[PDB]
Design a protein around this nucleic acid. Sequence first.
RNA 1: CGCCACUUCAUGGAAAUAAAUCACUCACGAAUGUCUU
Length: 94
Amino acid sequence: YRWEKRKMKQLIKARGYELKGDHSPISGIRENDNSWNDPNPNGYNYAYIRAILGLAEQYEFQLETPYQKAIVKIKSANNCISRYKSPLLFKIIN
RNA sequence: CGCCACUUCAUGGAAAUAAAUCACUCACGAAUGUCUU
């Protein structure tokens, strides 16, 4: 799986919107795979990876063109999942 | 370090329940038991 952030950036670049960044979106794990296009045979497998560690409402992408930014809104695609508490609990004792 | 907010604003249960439903007193008292022609 590749996180939805990768395809969010790719879709926005597919339109006449250019995003701020010196490095291309990261693909895979290797040290330098900053690529904009999927490998070759077919597109990567994508999923909403960041949901399992806490559901958000908006994704802000902050276009390079100043004083304007792109907002991606997350909705449950049928009103079933409105929130999700993070499943990790941090504890501080002594 | 800079920049930046969205979301949620009541449902479910109880909506009357028991006790007393008339009680006591008086239930006839006194006069007349024939009178006047």
